[PDB]
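User: what does the whole thing look like in 3D?
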Amino acid sequence: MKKSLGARTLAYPTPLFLVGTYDRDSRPNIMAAAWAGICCSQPPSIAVSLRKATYTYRSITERGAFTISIPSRAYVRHADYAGIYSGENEDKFASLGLTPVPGEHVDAPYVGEFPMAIELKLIHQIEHTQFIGEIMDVKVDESCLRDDGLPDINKVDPVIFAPVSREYYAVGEFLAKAFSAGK
Amino acid sequence: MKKSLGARTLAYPTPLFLVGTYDRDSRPNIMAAAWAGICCSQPPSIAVSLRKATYTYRSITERGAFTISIPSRAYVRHADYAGIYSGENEDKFASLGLTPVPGEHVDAPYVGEFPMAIELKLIHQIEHTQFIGEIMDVKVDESCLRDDGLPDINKVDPVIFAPVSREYYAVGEFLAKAFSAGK
Ligand SMILES: Cc1cc2nc3c(=O)[nH]c(=O)nc-3n(C[C@H](O)[C@H](O)[C@H](O)COP(=O)(O)O)c2cc1C
Ligand SMILES: Cc1cc2nc3c(=O)[nH]c(=O)nc-3n(C[C@H](O)[C@H](O)[C@H](O)COP(=O)(O)O)c2cc1C
Ligand SMILES: [Zn+2]
Ligand SMILES: [Zn+2]
Ligand SMILES: [Zn+2]
Ligand SMILES: [Zn+2]
Ligand SMILES: [Zn+2]
Ligand SMILES: [Zn+2]
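Assistant: Here's the predicted 3D structure for the full assembly of 366 residues, as structure tokens:
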């Protein structure tokens, strides 16, 4: 039998993206975003819903660029910190002891310690409010790649956010091949 | 050291939502969507990027309503099937032996066998192409709820999609509390 929980922001999985930017004085920042996901395959793009109150919002409107860094479980507390505190008057990289690595393709830093980072160019600002970034590059630690050059998600070891209950989870075991299992 | 994988639709986690609809003749359908996620907290909303070629696209434009059903690992093959084959000339519920349960709040079916189902009213069609649904209700199997009435994600046991490598994964272990661990 099902129970109704009502109209809640409740779905699984949700991501835990750290959205990286530079402010007008080139101060690097990261914030946590779970209201996000891939939106298009042409160009490859990610949508992120960022509130106007966030310092990151301002930086993206100014520079037209941002990164997404994907934490591994070792950095779950760091990621949470970035989702509690604002960078308006704090350098979170300094506070967290993390490295703001300049993007190679876009005007934004990513988190060097994290296993995976995505460089994005702002292509749409939709206003419901969402920034749409075109994926310019996806960078992954060599230690996390399979022989065919794609990532091993269990080596990346990304964090999952459970909304409402407000918890973080790891990725578990392989289940099946997509575009295959259903045949 | 990082390696560049180039401009790919590569991020983790991504969801595996089964988007449920009725066509003009009240035939129930489900398709798989991973280019999706929560977009807003007011109203609580999910964005789904559905291609014009899908039969589901047509049904959502006609009825203004859809559901999201979240498969557990037992239904990973079923979910994959729904993402390979079209419902234009096939009843996938019949093919899969699944139950199209009418929504209580919206004009769309959900998958009765799945642990969690979300009923959505179409509120925006953005055209990059995305349907924005307002969450009207979230329904969860009683067996999957904690004593406080929220779901246990490991009991729900939702599927995660790994894009490009095209694989499905389970959710693993609890890591930490959000809005807490970072303090
Ligand atoms: C798990 C989690 C998910 C979050 N998701 C979002 C989100 O999708 N959009 C948003 O605007 N804020 C989100 N937040 C809140 C911001 O990360 C938070 O307001 C942050 O302090 C903003 O930092 P900034 O002012 O330095 O940009 C989230 C926080 C956490 C911990
Ligand atoms: C893992 C996976 C993810 C998918 N994600 C999407 C998506 O986000 N949007 C989309 O238009 N198609 C997506 N597809 C493809 C559709 O599910 C597929 O075209 C389906 O046959 C459409 O069914 P319909 O014609 O009955 O609506 C996905 C398929 C799979 C297996
Ligand atoms: Zn898009
Ligand atoms: Zn698209
Ligand atoms: Zn090898
Ligand atoms: Zn929205
Ligand atoms: Zn919003
Ligand atoms: Zn109990």
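In plain terms: Residues 1-183 of chain A form a domain with the Pnp Oxidase; Chain A fold (CATH 2.30.110.10). The longest helix of chain A spans residues 55-63.
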